[PDB]
Amino acid sequence: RNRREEILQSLALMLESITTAKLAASVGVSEAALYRHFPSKTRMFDSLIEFIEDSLITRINLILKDEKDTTARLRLIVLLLLGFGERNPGLTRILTGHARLQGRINQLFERIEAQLRQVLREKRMREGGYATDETLLASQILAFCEGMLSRFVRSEFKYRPTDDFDARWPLIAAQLQ
Amino acid sequence: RNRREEILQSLALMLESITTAKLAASVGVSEAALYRHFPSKTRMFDSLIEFIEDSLITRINLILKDEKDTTARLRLIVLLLLGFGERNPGLTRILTGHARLQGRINQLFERIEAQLRQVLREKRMREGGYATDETLLASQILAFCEGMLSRFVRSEFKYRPTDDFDARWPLIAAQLQ
């Protein structure tokens, strides 16, 4: 439980810089034990993407209750995606292609997209909404985020996702009209 | 010359759906001959990316002289990138990661970025310019394009880059103030 996300953290770190025997050891436990959590290396890579996705949602559910204004929530969620990709180069090169189990990656994206989609919806919900389809908008914002994460990896990490974010945000805000 | 881009077209098609013996045959010529153009499979994959990049610039140099207005030039160049990725799924999965020689891919991107960067520059050149660094802007537009190309591949081609472009362009135009 608290130990599974422990095998997943150790996994993300190993990717960063597998071997189920070294990983099991990493977390004071044995292969037999580790395999009782993740019987296949395929299942834990899935759980790893899922772990990222859940962790990412947990960070977003925090924004949605600190900030009530839609533009502010957006600003932070986008900053979370950028910042996450920047802090986790290894994981971000997997979500960006440069590394199947891609249905699970794509699920993670459709997922972050639906959280964006509703933050944009909860705007008309109390303003009975945007002049643009929130589906078109959510996907327009995610495309940027996804494009910034895809540079970074490309430029051999010369371009950091959160560089000049204060100069960029305005460009995105101009799309929320 | 006209025959090299012929080996490169046949290459792009084969990727779409190698083997230097089948490729050579493809173009009524022999391996010996083909190898005198591209001695290494590494050199022609490079020439293939370059071929894409040059072809892409050729299409842009056309826009720059049909349309004189900056927003119109932009609209089309972005539509060319989207449309290109949509017409060439195979090549676009290589530029998107899902396929080293990545310094050459990245060069292609920095390249399309510098063409964007100057179309934005040639705006102040006769209006002595945008309220945003054209470098920040060019890279903001390319990020979107790159993000749309990265979906497409992801969604197993459910999301086409040029879908709803007429509803999206406005969102980008709002970033040119």
From Swiss-Prot, chains A, B:
Full protein name: Nucleoid occlusion factor SlmA
PANTHER family: HTH-TYPE TRANSCRIPTIONAL REGULATOR RUTR, NUCLEOID OCCLUSION FACTOR SLMA
GO MF annotations, alphabetized: DNA-binding transcription factor activity; transcription cis-regulatory region binding
Source superkingdom: Bacteria
Subcellular location: Cytoplasm, Nucleoid
UniProt keyword list: Cell cycle, Cell division, Coiled coil, Cytoplasm, DNA-binding
Coiled coil ranges: 100-124
Family (UniProt): Belongs to the nucleoid occlusion factor SlmA family.
GO-annotated cellular components: bacterial nucleoid; cytoplasm
Organism: Escherichia coli O1:K1 / APEC
Pfam families: SlmA-like_C, TetR_N
Keyword ATP-binding belongs to the record: no
BP GO annotations: cell division; negative regulation of division septum assembly
Function recorded in the entry: Required for nucleoid occlusion (NO) phenomenon, which prevents Z-ring formation and cell division over the nucleoid. Acts as a DNA-associated cell division inhibitor that binds simultaneously chromosomal DNA and FtsZ, and disrupts the assembly of FtsZ polymers. SlmA-DNA-binding sequences (SBS) are dispersed on non-Ter regions of the chromosome, preventing FtsZ polymerization at these regions.
TM annotation in the entry: none
